Amino acid sequence: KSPALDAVVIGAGVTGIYQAFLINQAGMKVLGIEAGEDVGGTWYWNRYPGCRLDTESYAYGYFALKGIIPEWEWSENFASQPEMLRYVNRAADAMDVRKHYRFNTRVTAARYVENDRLWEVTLDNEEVVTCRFLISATGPLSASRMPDIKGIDSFKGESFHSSRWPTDAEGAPKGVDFTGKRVGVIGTGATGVQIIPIAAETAKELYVFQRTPNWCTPLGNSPMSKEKMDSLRNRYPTILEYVKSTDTAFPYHRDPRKGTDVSESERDAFFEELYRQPGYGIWLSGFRDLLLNKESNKFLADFVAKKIRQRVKDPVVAEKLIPKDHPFGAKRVPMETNYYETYNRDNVHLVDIREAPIQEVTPEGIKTADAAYDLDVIIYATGFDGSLDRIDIRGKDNVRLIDAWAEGPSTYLGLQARGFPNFFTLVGPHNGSTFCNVGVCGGLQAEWVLRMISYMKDNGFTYSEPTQAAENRWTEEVYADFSRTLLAEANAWWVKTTTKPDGSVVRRTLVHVSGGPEYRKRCEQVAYNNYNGFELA
Ligand SMILES: Cc1cc2nc3c(=O)[nH]c(=O)nc-3n(C[C@H](O)[C@H](O)[C@H](O)COP(=O)(O)OP(=O)(O)OC[C@H]3O[C@@H](n4cnc5c(N)ncnc54)[C@H](O)[C@@H]3O)c2cc1C
Ligand SMILES: NC(=O)c1ccc[n+]([C@@H]2O[C@H](COP(=O)([O-])OP(=O)(O)OC[C@H]3O[C@@H](n4cnc5c(N)ncnc54)[C@H](OP(=O)(O)O)[C@@H]3O)[C@@H](O)[C@H]2O)c1
Numbered sequence: 244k245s246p247a248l249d250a251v252v253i254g255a256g257v258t259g260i261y262q263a264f265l266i267n268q269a270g271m272k273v274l275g276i277e278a279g280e281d282v283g284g285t286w287y288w289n290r291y292p293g294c295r296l297d298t299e300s301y302a303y304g305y306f307a308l309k310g311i312i313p314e315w316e317w318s319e320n321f322a323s324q325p326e327m328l329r330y331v332n333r334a335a336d337a338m339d340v341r342k343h344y345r346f347n348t349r350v351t352a353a354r355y356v357e358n359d360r361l362w363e364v365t366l367d368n369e370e371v372v373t374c375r376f377l378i379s380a381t382g383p384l385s386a387s388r389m390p391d392i393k394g395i396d397s398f399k400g401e402s403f404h405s406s407r408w409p410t411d412a413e414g415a416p417k418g419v420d421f422t423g424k425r426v427g428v429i430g431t432g433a434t435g436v437q438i439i440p441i442a443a444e445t446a447k448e449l450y451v452f453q454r455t456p457n458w459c460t461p462l463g464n465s466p467m468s469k470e471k472m473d474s475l476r477n478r479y480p481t482i483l484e485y486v487k488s489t490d491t492a493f494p495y496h497r498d499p500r501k502g503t504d505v506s507e508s509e510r511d512a513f514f515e516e517l518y519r520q521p522g523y524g525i526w527l528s529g530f531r532d533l534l535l536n537k538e539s540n541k542f543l544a545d546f547v548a549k550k551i552r553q554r555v556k557d558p559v560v561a562e563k564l565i566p567k568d569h570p571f572g573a574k575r576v577p578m579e580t581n582y583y584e585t586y587n588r589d590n591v592h593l594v595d596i597r598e599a600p601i602q603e604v605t606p607e608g609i610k611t612a613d614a615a616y617d618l619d620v621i622i623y624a625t626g627f628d629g630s631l632d633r634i635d636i637r638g639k640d641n642v643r644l645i646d647a648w649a650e651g652p653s654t655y656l657g658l659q660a661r662g663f664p665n666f667f668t669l670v671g672p673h674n675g676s677t678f679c680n681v682g683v684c685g686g687l688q689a690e691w692v693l694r695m696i697s698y699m700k701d702n703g704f705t706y707s708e709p710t711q712a713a714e715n716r717w718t719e720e721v722y723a724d725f726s727r728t729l730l731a732e733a734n735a736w737w738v739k740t741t742t743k744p745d746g747s748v749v750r751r752t753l754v755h756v757s758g759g760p761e762y763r764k765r766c767e768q769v770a771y772n773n774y775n776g777f778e779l780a
């Protein structure tokens with residue numbers, strides 16, 4: 244029995260559509276599957292107020308850099324979601340990729356057929372399709388879901404979850420005019436920090452329910468002149484080589500100096516300058532030991548805390564906005580447009596729900612351990628937590644992917660898992676999404692997988708699976724790299740420690756943090772050497 248398809252690609256975000264385009268371009272038969280109506284992923288689903296890139300538009304736009312849509316015109320230095328969706332749509336047109344997709348269709352199960360070396364993919368628990376290779380591009384973040392909070396359904400006002408915002412016939416978000424309404428926003432991640440300032444413009448009152456403050460820095464967004472855009476486009480071959488060489492694929496690289504190689508005076512001027520410069524420079528152009536050394540991190544953390552105390556008038560509000568929890572840059576840093584100055588407004592209140600946890604949502608609003616809040620609107624900006632978990636993925640011996648990774652993700656090259664032959668996992672925390680410019684990182688990863696699939700076709704191979712030794716070595720290296728950073732202690736739950744019944748200890752990280760260029764170099768050493776570490780047949 245032979246499969247109907249060379250490959251199934253799950254997902255129509257920037258990663259999946261590019262992967263599908265590439266497979267078809269190589270003269271293979273691909274079917275893409277997408278839950279939503281159309282292309283975009285992130286940029287299709289997230290329509291909340293203030294949704295905007297943290298990556299410079301020209302650097303995220305890999306499809307423009309690569310010469311798929313080089314004529315593309317960015318209107319701002321950090322594109323908003325509507326422009327992002329137009330971008331993805333234009334790319335999809337040029338790739339002529341929509342014809343290879345089933346939209347409005349959810350993959351419910353994927354089961355590997357050992358005797359046939361193929362994947363049975365189940366669509367909406369009904370139709371089954373067969374493919375040689377299954378490729379997930381289901382997103383590094385999973386699921387809009389109501390958060391773990393009692394009484395959400397009881398609220399009589401307007402509810403919004405940030406990743407499911409209601410829209411009008413044009414696709415533009417609706418119910419965004421908060422004139423005369425008392426608003427609650429739960430969560431202060433990158434999503435909340437984008438919503439809060441804009442909600443404040445129209446809301447009668449705004450309560451921010453903050454469980455943990457993040458380190459946020461100014462975005463410094465501005466419009467993009469035609470002159471600048473043309474100048475950038477002309478420089479695209481240089482820009483593409485540059486972003487292909489930095490550790491994150493953002494257009495920034497670490498200063499070669501340690502924090503202690505300069506005086507306190509010099510560090511101060513250095514930070515002051517970066518802080519005022521648009522984009523991630525203050526994080527990604529920092530001293531080389533910023534994420535390796537406690538003292539170095541403290542220099543910058545102390546500086547950013549100084550800035551928060553500058554921008555927020557009330558000294559009490561300010562200290563509750565400054566993290567003590569974690570080092571600077573240990574989470575992907577939220578960038579902001581006048582975030583801190585929002586709290587200076589009369590109609591804006593910070594509610595500390597660490598000290599006073601939410602007990603439940605109510606017909607009238609929200610109830611904390613020591614107060615009740617009457618509200619007309621609640622916005623859940625409460626995040627995402629994996630996209631693969633929602634699919635019943637079964638490998639050899641009917642083993643669940645969920646179980647195989649229960650002790651932490653285990654892969655070779657971040658791309659295949661032993662037990663799951665012919666299955667590629669694109670763009671997730673386990674292969675570097677967390678801190679990447681995903682437009683570039685994801686695109687490069689899809690090209691590598693294409694090259695592997697093409698090699699197998701050329702050689703008549705129909706089976707690929709990592710050896711246990713290659714997978715173990717790779718996964719142990721990924722942990723070792725991670726453990727040398729400050730992230731190890733900062734996010735404890737990012738490490739899975741298993742002490743087996745026999746007494747041995749296994750440590751895995753949920754988050755791969757190695758430099759992109761180094762990671763790709765390793766992938767090419769493997770590929771060139773006839774995919775050493777993969778069993779192929
Ligand atoms: C608000 C927001 C802002 C961001 N900004 C940046 C940024 O500035 N820079 C950056 O590098 N990264 C950013 N990211 C991270 C972002 O995930 C990537 O930039 C990128 O969009 C990921 O693309 P993707 O194709 O891999 O996944 P997605 O864009 O998430 O697409 C995955 C698709 O798969 C579909 N899918 C999932 N499961 C199934 C299934 N079972 N069956 C059928 N379809 C399924 C989903 O519907 C979705 O459309 C941001 C993320 C968010 C949420
Ligand atoms: N380009 C951009 O500027 C942009 C915009 C949005 C998102 N993103 C990316 O997408 C990722 C997700 O960001 P996000 O802001 O949507 O989510 P997030 O980072 O996970 O933050 C969710 C927020 O909600 C809180 N929270 C979660 N569950 C809660 C509950 N049950 N009750 C009360 N509070 C709760 C969290 O607090 P705790 O910390 O205590 O859990 C946190 O403050 C980010 O890592 C970011 O990189 C990027």
Ligand code: NA
Pocket residue numbers: 586587588589590591592
């Ligand atoms: Na105030």
